[PDB]
């Protein structure tokens, strides 16, 4: 994609805020239409600005657009949570099809944060019968993106076996993740206690399981 | 009130030819074009092509004009102001660049500078260019977990684990309790395995009076698990 | 482009504004001779076709009675209502046609012609008689 | 005020110039719907609303011939002659009817459509063919 926007563009609660959207010589951002899309990653995005400044039915005034002669540009008035996702941008004609931008994700701060939720979950008995164990360490309703995740045999550290997923965000407008370990039974019955400790940028929750209970 | 539906999830090897409907529905299919965009992490969205159903005005990318053909029926009315059309789509010479969901949407206006501009899109599709297999899953029950001890919220679910073709979905009852549903996404294993779960957060008093049966349908592999999640408890947090 | 009589009834209203003339001229004048005289056969297509400009000259009266008068496009003073169809423009006239836009209207229909016949030539024409004088 | 249908018969000339449309919707569209066909009592009041529509279209050539058209209040160029009516201004409006105004004006009111259809038209039209050319 030669349309190039911002990088990565926070906020803060109930300001504007500015994505830029631009590119090559043929992609001039000039005698072409350009057109903004809210992008909610892996479900249904939306239009919101269309062929210019114009925007899409439905669509509050907060949002407004503007076309210099070798850029575009979105400006957001009133930042609310439900704004905290990635916009894209692209450039077109009328016979043209699209043409989309490298991406602006937004991050709108100066909101209430949350206090995580984190669950342990032992193997089961049915899979004690499958020969295996895996331990599920769930987390949700946490405010910023960062969440780092150790699994401790014993209380000492475990490397194999050990996956963490990626920060998701909950329809709530909060956040959701998980981690799970891998263990053989060997491994399940030769420990005491196992803890699941996620680090918080301003906390530290941490649960601990045992095979004997 | 257009109310499109695209086609169900299917599995392909390289080299190889797939074909994806889009059924319309509740909006007259000859009055907009028929656009065509995919998503693939690769290389991001690009769009593909449109089409016009009235005047069979075909419209594709540079890139995609010797691989994709596009394809339109005529349009059945059922009102006077709605009809079901259809708009295939074939693909041929898949290669490992062309995995990801993929769209079919509506077009703007029917006069204008921006008229084929997609304004109502369908649900997806996900494609996986694969030389492997596909292989079922392996569906396990979950032990019911404590929310809260002081509130009284247990979580129990279910564990899809070790599917190589297209994600599965999962009902509760029969589609019967939608409220605490949580799907977890799916992994990536080092064979290229992948593996999620799911969970719903019921109430400890629950357990006499209501009945939870996960149900998996995985459609590429055509199979169907039902589990019955065991109300018995072994979280030292949730027996109270 | 022409095509014809209602041609453009499923066209866009911009689109079908462009042959305001090609429906007006087919109304009115479906000229049936009558000179053969024939007892109770004329009296109802006689009725019908009387009728017939009974309604245009409701439709004229109505078009007179506002301050619009040429039989053609025309502008008015009174403001449209967000209430009525909240859309904005090229909205209306790039995707929609009449009847879906009469069919939009048609609750809110009644008193727009009351709006335009009374705080328009009930009050323009009395502003007219009160500034002409100097 | 409105008092609806001839409601300000007997109030002065100006208050009863506030209800032009009221009188003017009324008596073109009294529409009856025949369509039941019985033979020799629809001749009559067909007569009946053909001549009505004879009268109202003699009324709109006489409105049409003058520098007026437009149904609604409108000034001439043709001035007050001092022999009809020899009373000042708010003296009419503000203490007579239409009725008697009409009732005073019977003795002179032939004379003013022939000012009104040769002394206007019959020049005004001929002065702007000869100063439309500049
Ligand atoms: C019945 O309903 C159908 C469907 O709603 C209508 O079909 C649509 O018709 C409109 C125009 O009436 C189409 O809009 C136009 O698309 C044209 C496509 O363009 C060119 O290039 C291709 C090659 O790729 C050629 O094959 C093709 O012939 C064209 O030459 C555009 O060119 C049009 O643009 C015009 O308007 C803009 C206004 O901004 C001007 O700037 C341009 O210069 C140009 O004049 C226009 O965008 C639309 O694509 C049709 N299909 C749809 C909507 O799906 C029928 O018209 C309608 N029929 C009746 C009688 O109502
Ligand atoms: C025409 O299209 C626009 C945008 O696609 C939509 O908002 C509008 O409702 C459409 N018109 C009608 C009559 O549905
Ligand atoms: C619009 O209509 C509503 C109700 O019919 C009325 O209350 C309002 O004053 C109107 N506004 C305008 C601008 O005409
Ligand atoms: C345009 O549409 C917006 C959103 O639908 C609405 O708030 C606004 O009043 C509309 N303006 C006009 C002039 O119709
Ligand atoms: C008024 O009328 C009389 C007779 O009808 C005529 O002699 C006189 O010239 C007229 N005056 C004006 C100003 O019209
Ligand atoms: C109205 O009153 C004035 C003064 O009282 C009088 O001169 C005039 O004749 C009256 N109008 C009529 C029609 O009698």
């Known amino acids: 994609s030669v349309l190039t926007q911002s990088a990565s563009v926070s906020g803060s609660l109930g300001q504007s805020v500015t994505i830029s959207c631009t590119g090559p010589n043929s992609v001039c951002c000039s005698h072409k239409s350009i057109s903004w899309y809210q992008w909610p990653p892996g479900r249904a995005p939306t239009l919101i600005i269309y062929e210019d400044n114009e925007r899409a039915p439905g669509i509050s005034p907060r949002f407004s657009g503007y076309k210099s002669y070798w850029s575009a540009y979105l400006t957001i008035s009133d930042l609310r949570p439900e704004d905290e996702t990635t916009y894209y941008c692209c450039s077109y004609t009328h016979n043209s099809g699209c043409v989309f931008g490298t991406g602006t994700k937004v991050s709108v701060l100066g909101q209430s944060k949350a206090n995580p939720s984190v669950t342990l979950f032992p193997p089961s008995s049915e899979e004690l019968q499958a020969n295996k164990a895996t331990l599920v360490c769930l987390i949700s309703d946490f405010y910023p993106g960062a969440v780092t995740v150790a699994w401790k045999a014993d209380s000492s550290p475990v490397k194999a076996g050990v996956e963490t997923t990626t920060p998701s965000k909950q329809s709530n407008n909060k956040y959701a993740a998980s981690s799970y370990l891998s263990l053989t039974p060997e491994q399940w019955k030769s420990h005491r206690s196992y803890s699941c400790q996620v680090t918080h940028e301003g906390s530290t929750v941490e649960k601990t399981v045992a095979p004997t209970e | 009130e257009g109310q499109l539906v695209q086609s169900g999830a299917e599995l392909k090897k390289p080299g190889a030819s797939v074909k994806i409907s889009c059924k319309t529905s509740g909006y007259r299919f000859n009055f907009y074009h028929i656009n065509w965009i995919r998503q693939t992490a690769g290389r991001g969205p690009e769009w593909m092509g449109w089409?016009?159903?009235?005047?069979?005005?075909?419209?594709?990318?540079?890139?995609?004009?010797?691989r994709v053909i596009m394809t339109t029926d005529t349009e059945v009315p059922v009102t006077s102001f709605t009809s079901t059309g259809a708009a295939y789509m074939e693909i041929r010479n898949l290669k490992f660049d062309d995995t990801g969901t993929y769209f079919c949407?509506?077009?703007?206006?029917?006069?204008?500078?921006?008229?084929?501009?997609?304004?109502?899109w369908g649900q997806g599709t996900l494609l996986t260019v694969s030389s492997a297999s596909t292989k079922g899953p392996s569906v396990f029950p979950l032990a019911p977990s404590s929310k809260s001890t002081s509130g009284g919220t247990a979580a129990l679910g279910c564990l899809v684990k070790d599917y190589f073709p297209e994600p599965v979905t999962v009902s509760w009852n029969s589609g019967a309790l939608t409220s605490g549903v949580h799907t977890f996404p799916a992994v990536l294993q080092s064979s290229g395995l992948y593996s999620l779960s799911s969970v719903v957060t019921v109430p400890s008093s629950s357990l006499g009076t209501q009945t939870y049966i996960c149900n998996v349908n995985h459609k590429p592999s055509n199979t169907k698990v039902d589990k019955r999640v065991e109300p018995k408890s072994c979280d030292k947090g949730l027996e109270v | 482009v022409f095509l014809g009589f209602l041609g453009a009834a499923g066209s866009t209203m911009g689109a079908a504004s462009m042959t305001l003339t090609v429906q007006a001229r087919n109304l009115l004048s479906g000229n049936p001779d009558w000179l053969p005289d024939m007892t109770v056969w004329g009296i109802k297509q006689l009725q019908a076709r009387v009728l017939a400009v009974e309604r245009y000259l409701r439709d004229q009266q109505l078009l007179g009675i506002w301050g619009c008068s040429g039989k053609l496009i025309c502008c008015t003073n009174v403001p449209w209502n967000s209430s009525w169809s909240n859309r904005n423009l090229s909205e209306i006239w790039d995707n929609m046609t009449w009847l879906q836009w009469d069919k939009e209207i048609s609750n809110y229909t009644q008193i727009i012609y009351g709006l335009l016949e009374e705080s328009q030539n009930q009050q323009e024409k009395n502003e007219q008689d009160l500034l002409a004088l100097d | 005020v409105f008092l609806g249908f001839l409601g300000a018969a007997g109030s002065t000339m100006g208050a009863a110039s506030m209800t032009l449309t009221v009188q003017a919707r009324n008596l073109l569209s009294g529409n009856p719907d025949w369509l039941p066909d019985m033979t020799v009592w629809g001749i009559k009041q067909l007569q009946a609303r053909v001549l009505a529509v004879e009268r109202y279209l003699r009324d709109q050539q006489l409105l049409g011939i003058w520098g007026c058209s437009g149904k609604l209040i409108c000034c001439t160029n043709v001035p007050w002659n001092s022999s009809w009516s020899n009373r000042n201004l708010s003296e009419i409006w503000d203490n007579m009817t239409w009725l008697q105004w009409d009732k005073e004006i019977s003795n002179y009111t032939q004379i003013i459509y022939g000012l009104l259809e040769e002394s206007q038209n019959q020049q005004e039209k001929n002065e702007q063919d000869l100063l439309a050319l500049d």
């Open positions: 949407a509506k077009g703007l206006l029917r006069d204008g500078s921006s008229t084929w501009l997609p304004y109502l």
């Open positions: 089409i016009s159903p009235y005047s069979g005005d075909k419209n594709l990318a540079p890139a995609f004009q010797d």
